[PDB]
Amino acid sequence: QFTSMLQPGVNKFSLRMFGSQKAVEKEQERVKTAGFWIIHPYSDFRFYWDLIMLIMMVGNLVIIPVGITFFTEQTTTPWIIFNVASDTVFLLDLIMNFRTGTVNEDSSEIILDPKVIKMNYLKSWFVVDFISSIPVDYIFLIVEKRALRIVRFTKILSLLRLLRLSRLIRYIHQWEEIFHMTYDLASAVVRIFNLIGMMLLLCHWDGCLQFLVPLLQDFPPDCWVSLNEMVNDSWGKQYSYALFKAMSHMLCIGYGAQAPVSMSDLWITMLSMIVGATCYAMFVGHATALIQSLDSSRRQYQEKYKQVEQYMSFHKLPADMRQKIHDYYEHRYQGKIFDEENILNELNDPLREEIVNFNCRKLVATMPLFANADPNFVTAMLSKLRFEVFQPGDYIIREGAVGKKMYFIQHGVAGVITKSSKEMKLTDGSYFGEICLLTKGRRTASVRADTYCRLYSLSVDNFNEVLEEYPMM
Amino acid sequence: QFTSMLQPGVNKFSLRMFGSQKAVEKEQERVKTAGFWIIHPYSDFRFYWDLIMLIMMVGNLVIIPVGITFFTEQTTTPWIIFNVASDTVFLLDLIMNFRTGTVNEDSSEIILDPKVIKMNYLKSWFVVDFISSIPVDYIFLIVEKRALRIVRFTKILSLLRLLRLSRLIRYIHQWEEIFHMTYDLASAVVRIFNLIGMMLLLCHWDGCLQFLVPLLQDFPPDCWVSLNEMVNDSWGKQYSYALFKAMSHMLCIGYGAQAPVSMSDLWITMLSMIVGATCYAMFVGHATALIQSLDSSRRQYQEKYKQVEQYMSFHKLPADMRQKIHDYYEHRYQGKIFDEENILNELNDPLREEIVNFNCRKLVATMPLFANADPNFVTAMLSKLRFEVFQPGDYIIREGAVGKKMYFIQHGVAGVITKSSKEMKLTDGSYFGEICLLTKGRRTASVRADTYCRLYSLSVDNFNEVLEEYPMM
Amino acid sequence: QFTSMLQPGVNKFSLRMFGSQKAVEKEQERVKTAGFWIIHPYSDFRFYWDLIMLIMMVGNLVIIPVGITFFTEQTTTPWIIFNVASDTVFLLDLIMNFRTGTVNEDSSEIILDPKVIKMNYLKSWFVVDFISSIPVDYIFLIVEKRALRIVRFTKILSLLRLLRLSRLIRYIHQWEEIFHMTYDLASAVVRIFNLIGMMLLLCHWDGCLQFLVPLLQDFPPDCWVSLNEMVNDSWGKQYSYALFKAMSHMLCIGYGAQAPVSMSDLWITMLSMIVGATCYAMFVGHATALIQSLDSSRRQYQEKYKQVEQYMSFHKLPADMRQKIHDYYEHRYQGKIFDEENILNELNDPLREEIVNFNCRKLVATMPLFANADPNFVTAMLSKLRFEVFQPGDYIIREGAVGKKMYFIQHGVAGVITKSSKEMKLTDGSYFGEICLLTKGRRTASVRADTYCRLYSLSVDNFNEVLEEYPMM
Amino acid sequence: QFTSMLQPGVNKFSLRMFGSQKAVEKEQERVKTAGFWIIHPYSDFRFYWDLIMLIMMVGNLVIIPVGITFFTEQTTTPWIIFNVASDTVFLLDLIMNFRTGTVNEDSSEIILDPKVIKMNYLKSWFVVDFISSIPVDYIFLIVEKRALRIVRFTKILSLLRLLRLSRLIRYIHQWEEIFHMTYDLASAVVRIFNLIGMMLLLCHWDGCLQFLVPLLQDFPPDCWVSLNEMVNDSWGKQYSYALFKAMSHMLCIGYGAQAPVSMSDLWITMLSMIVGATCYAMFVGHATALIQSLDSSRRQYQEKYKQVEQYMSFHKLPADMRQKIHDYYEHRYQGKIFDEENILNELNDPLREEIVNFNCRKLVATMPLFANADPNFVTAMLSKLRFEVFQPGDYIIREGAVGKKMYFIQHGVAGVITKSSKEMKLTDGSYFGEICLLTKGRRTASVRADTYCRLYSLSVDNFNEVLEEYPMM
Ligand SMILES: COc1cc2c(cc1OC)CC(=O)N(CCCN(C)C[C@H]1Cc3cc(OC)c(OC)cc31)CC2
Ligand SMILES: CC(C)CCC[C@@H](C)[C@H]1CC[C@H]2[C@@H]3CC=C4C[C@@H](O)CC[C@]4(C)[C@H]3CC[C@]12C
Ligand SMILES: CC(C)CCC[C@@H](C)[C@H]1CC[C@H]2[C@@H]3CC=C4C[C@@H](O)CC[C@]4(C)[C@H]3CC[C@]12C
Ligand SMILES: CC(C)CCC[C@@H](C)[C@H]1CC[C@H]2[C@@H]3CC=C4C[C@@H](O)CC[C@]4(C)[C@H]3CC[C@]12C
Ligand SMILES: CC(C)CCC[C@@H](C)[C@H]1CC[C@H]2[C@@H]3CC=C4C[C@@H](O)CC[C@]4(C)[C@H]3CC[C@]12C
């Protein structure tokens, strides 16, 4: 199964990235050119290793800053097992990254193990990854073995293990893009969550820095730790007030107790103020983009109607006409912005036929002429039907006018006013204007909408074009 | 009338959601399939019950947090009548929700009482609604009947009645969507008001939490209540300073008196800081969307002219030509962005005829050829007329050029320069270029705009097409 | 001249609102129907009275709050002359508003003095305007003439003169709309300035309220004035610290000295915090809209190229082809988003001819065939020319291919590779492909761009269409 | 080389601004009309002088405010060499600006030395530039030579050298526009960086002002310097706390130590609060524009699909059909918004042919009819091919239907269901519907997609049109 895990298995993502099985099976074979040493970027092992690393790299980036800053002994047996075990998992990841193909913009997944992948990692992120993976602090401690300066350096050297933020950022970005293909995550929701994670991590690290700079200076008499008398407090009361102090600078509220007296404090407060304000300005920006994208369809309709109001304003249309047009837009588009012609053009011939049959088949089927027609012909006619809304009192057809189009009534109560009978109120499902299909003369009756009336109009020219394609009918 | 209230009555919303009466009367009959136990989501009873619940659920969500936090006795007769009466109204609502059809995306309103509605509520919000409706606090008090721990639990158990926020949020969203169909509320104004309501409610609850966590700990010596000496103050001075403290953290101003000394305070301040900053970031985001949507039409014109400036920049047009084009855009579009062809195409044949007659009928009626024509023919010609603005000094028609279009003058003072008379200044309402309609030769006079001149041009080809449809004229 | 001032004079705004002189002179006559009692909303008297009122209403809204709050005696002779003189100017304005026509959306300017204007003001803003104009404080003082309560009421009654904010807001909105027609003020710059004015005015009034509520309570012992010992300080040190306190709550910085001890202070601080945060959220929103509209043209190009990158990504085009396409877009559109077809269609026939002659006349004039042609024919051909950019190495024409288009070279160095001579490098202004105009055969030479090459192509079909219109040439 | 440096050399910017070499060489000659006294705005000397000035003007605008405010003696030999040397470089720049051509909107680069450039600088920025370049402070000191008032004026007079901000702003804007042509810098990234530079500079200057106003008043007893006892502290502890105080007002956090007691402090704090809040509101605005422009392509796709959802909602399509359409959009556009017709129309004939050959040549080449065709004919057919995605189960071709289009299969497994054989599963690269090219009859087999199936369809009409152009084939 080792070859199977290292190879991109047939999944919804694979079949949507590479075209189809025969394409996925071609890529699986391309990996089999190198042996036991090539992992595909989309491989499930890369998926499983990346899910193991991301849990480990959030835990390390939350436990490691607290362990150096708020605990005096980091050479104790539990902290050496934790830092060696994490460093081993991270060092394996560096070896695996040398043998994992890299997705490439405008190309395939670089896969040649000797130079395509090994010489791209070395020229790119190998150093940041080497410094984070290696236990520099333990190497210095072993080489060096006046101890208090040694303990102060080890604490600074063990924060080179926070460069794993490079891998957490890179791995999250790689798998978020794979998930965007696999699912349709809203871009704004994915982006705001990456910042909320980055803001929480930076607030944790700023809280730790606010106690590390005072700790690495032996708690100077003007440091907040000494001034608030929290040098001897428990790690919880030291961490909670350091996070409180760092969150307060970030959301820019105020301070822990008082304004910074010392120069290490005045500068570490200013770094946490600049980091905090930039993160909040970005959160207000990400929040604005999420809020704009939630109401995009309703905002786009309002921008469409406002332009209709500007047309009416330019032509100075009377207020009565301006309300007839507002009532038409409310009852024609129903608050919905869509382009039927563009949306229908994008759809394939089978999906267009299904949408047209659901919308128009019932009404056309009732008409006697289309009842006995071949389903192929009816489907051609159904495409021709155009949707038209007539407001109350409007004359859909006027007596004595040339008849260029017949109407199928989807909804609304119309009324056929004539000279002989003068009383015929057609309702939902009824058809009018039928005679105007092969006579090419003049309409004998006038139909007036008596309520809004949503109708489907087939123009005599369009009927002829579909009729030309099917000669018998 | 019980059947009538439970059934969706013929209203502007019903006739705009379901197509028309015969459709509304069909739905009213669909409800009559189940008896006395089915309420339509659009029913007026659902409207009236939801208006009763929303007033009750704002009152309960404002009175209930204050009653538990700032008043020691909640077993007094007035607070038991208030909490039993509200719990009865809320419990009825749970029974009614089991028998109310649920609007469904992509479908009808689920209406079958036995499983379509009952088994969807149980699998969805029944629990949150059961916990909020039941008086858990009173059930615990009755079962349990060392009392101080009992009073502290009852206070936490009586805040499970704040889960009614689920119903206030769901009911407000259901009826705001019904109102959006019933009226055209701006999406941004509706969304900002839902946040201002949610921000005010969260600020009220954070103020109460800031006194409840200290109260449930017997006012510990480091709590703000004890430090500011407000343990024995009136409920007004305790509530006002707790709201002041919670609003200050939310708008991120500062603190009530000093930075939090205790760990319950440092953590409850940090929760109110994170809740407050996220609510304000969302208010700055909702404010940006309201401000962008108020000036959408003016912003869209500026983006249209900026593109004209970019065309002029690419072609490096001289500054004099760039000002002639700016003056044309000011006097043609008048600061208004609209697409006449798209806006006219959307309108039905009667509304298009009305807009065209108001804009063009007066001018065409003056012309002698169109004066005696059948109103049907004139309406066809009026559609052909195209609107054209000629700047001062422009030559609308040049002598000796082939004549392909005649001009009707809506506004502006033109002037007919010829060789014989050489002085004829036509003004508003005048027509020129008329001879170029059936001669198909060359123009004998040159007309120069002497002011901006808004004219309507009928091309000889368009005159022929309308003339082809009406043979006699 | 009294009739002339009350009548809308022929100005750039009048001639752009009403169509032209004969339309403006028609409106001037419509005003002359009522006598000495009708002022047109666009009248210059309305302009001059509104410029007098706006200076007076900013001065009153800045001097009047300070005079009541920071000065004990407002019955002194200088403050009675100032408040009577301002009240007289404001009372005249109420009389004039009864006789000024009101611009109406979807209509003309309501002008009938007896009911169209008088009964619309009474039903609209007469009350707010009556309360602001009348000296209620002086009427109460005269009627009432235990004095300390009288002085406290008069101070509250004299703040009903701050309702003139209604007129400043209405007059600024009326004249900003008139200026938008008169000039093209950016909407965002006009809107941000209205808020900066409203924010400065609300900050001034919040500063005064922070000292008025303590003053109207005889400086209670817990008020900030008494706690900071500023009861007996000069009006400058009392106003400056009250503005500092109100600006600090508004920009949400902190407090003047300490968090509010009293309940009048805790509530007046909370009102100034909610007013301040809403104004700042709106300033961040107006700033976002100004910043987005400054770079609209550059942002729109980036959105256009990003879509080209998405087309290339979907088709998985090789990285080399992706760079050829990026270089084409840089050298064809030059970072400019414009639609030549839409921008040209909007322009009138004279402006289109001028832009086409400047862009193309020099190059076409050099060609021998078009040199002797009638300027009418050349102008028709110049419209047909299409702009095309060929990248270095591209083959503009290939030997042996059917010739459907000739090329005029605007810029770039091409090269004619043939079999006989095989060396001819054409440069700026040169024409190639000329033989392919009346032969309808095959090209004998292949022209390869040797640098980018911006050329104008005239298709043989387009040459024939212009040639069809002019038979002799 | 002096003439060469002053002349616009042939560079990527020059060849993209002026059309090509022959155009650049024409401009180089236009400069040679004036002698040794005309520098082109795009000249490399202007580039090199502007890069020298910008380093010098950032250094002066950072060192000069600190030198006046935090150092008592500015007449010392090192500060006189620094201020004379910088003033000499700045005075040369004023002389050079008199002889450098100015880029002009809508025109060429003003180049005539006597009046085009000299009389435009004098009427524009000569004064601000003269006041900044001249050492006013030293001129006053020499003329004047009771000394403490002289030292206080000199400190105010030496801040007229901060008007060089005019040149830093103008030079940065000129060279950022030149770089935008030279490279495609994102507008949002360039604009946010100009603000981060302006915010850092204003925060530096506000920190210095907070100590200069107290210094110029002899450290009054209520000034923060005296109250925090920092009058005698080192320049580092005075500057660091003044910057801390000014950054705190700007990001609106709080204060250095306490709220301002004196009136110089209450007003200098209010100026730094208004300057700081306006800069942060602009940073939140620039951050919103950068964040919106990073995800423009993904946001635009979501707005396109939301409109498809609104079309489906208006027609009330069943939920099953709504999921077939969502799956089509995911597998047709693949999350990418692009307009193939618009993107292809913009590209030149060679780039369109290359994109079409890469996308379609392999599949068409396999077909036997197109295998022996002339490459010219195949390229014409390849343009006709249209891309179509058929979902699983869809019938691409139905037996007995008239055949109007043949299909080339790019990806997916189809299946040819017939009556005779009834089993033929075509895969990637296969072609079906071929017989429907010259028969004009009815299809004998029905092909059903058995997986998504991305195919290229050539319509019989389009095949005929390309076949009409090439008669032999
Ligand atoms: C961060 O601040 C700096 C910014 C910059 C540079 C240095 C900086 O450090 C002070 C480098 C530089 O000069 N260029 C880039 C050098 C690359 N070349 C290709 C562009 C430059 C060289 C040249 C020459 C030109 O004359 C034709 C010209 O057109 C005006 C433009 C240019 C501008 C950016
Ligand atoms: C809800 C719909 C619109 C889909 C949106 C998907 C969202 C909710 C998902 C997709 C990927 C997710 C992210 C994946 C990984 C991380 C990194 C971690 O350190 C913090 C959480 C964070 C940032 C997740 C937050 C939630 C997330 C952004
Ligand atoms: C003014 C025009 C554009 C129409 C806009 C309608 C606005 C003003 C209306 C429509 C529905 C209304 C909301 C309905 C119910 C609630 C919940 C309540 O707890 C707070 C107020 C709030 C949130 C209302 C605020 C105002 C509101 C949003
Ligand atoms: C600079 C270009 C884009 C044109 C923009 C015009 C701007 C600068 C002008 C037009 C009208 C002006 C406003 C007119 C009247 C007032 C009310 C006053 O109490 C404060 C200033 C304020 C709000 C002005 C600010 C500047 C303003 C908004
Ligand atoms: C990264 C891609 C998108 C290109 C963007 C270019 C950006 C990073 C470059 C282009 C020009 C640059 C600016 C040029 C000059 C200055 C003035 C200086 O006082 C502060 C930095 C600042 C403001 C630079 C910041 C970075 C900058 C804005």
Numbering used by the authors:
A (entry chain C), B (entry chain D), C (entry chain A), D (entry chain B): 97 to 241, 252 to 579
Question: What did the study's authors say about this model?
Answer:
The cytoplasmic domain contains an N-terminal conserved HCN domain (HCND) and a C-terminal cyclic nucleotide-binding domain, which is connected to transmembrane helix S6 through a helical C-linker domain.
Here, we present the cryo-electron microscopy structure of human HCN1 channel in complex with inhibitor ivabradine, the drug on the market that acts on HCN channels. The overall architecture of ivabradine-bound HCN1 closely resembles the previously characterized apo state, with an RMSD of 0.5 Å. A nonprotein density is observed, surrounded by the S1, S4, and the unique HCND at the interface between the lipid bilayer and cytoplasmic side, a feature not present in any of the previous HCN1 and HCN4 structures. Specifically, the side chain of F143 on S1 forms π-stacking interactions with the methoxyphenyl ring of ivabradine. Additionally, N107 and F109 on the HCND, D140 on S1, W281, F285, and Y289 on S4 exhibit hydrophobic and van der Waals interactions with ivabradine. Notably, mutations such as D140A and F143A led to a dramatic decrease in ivabradine potency. In the ivabradine binding site, the residues F143, W281, and F285 exhibit slight inward conformational changes compared to apo HCN1, likely induced by ivabradine binding. In the ivabradine-bound state, W281 is oriented toward S1, nestled within a hydrophobic cavity at the interface of S4, S1, and the HCND.
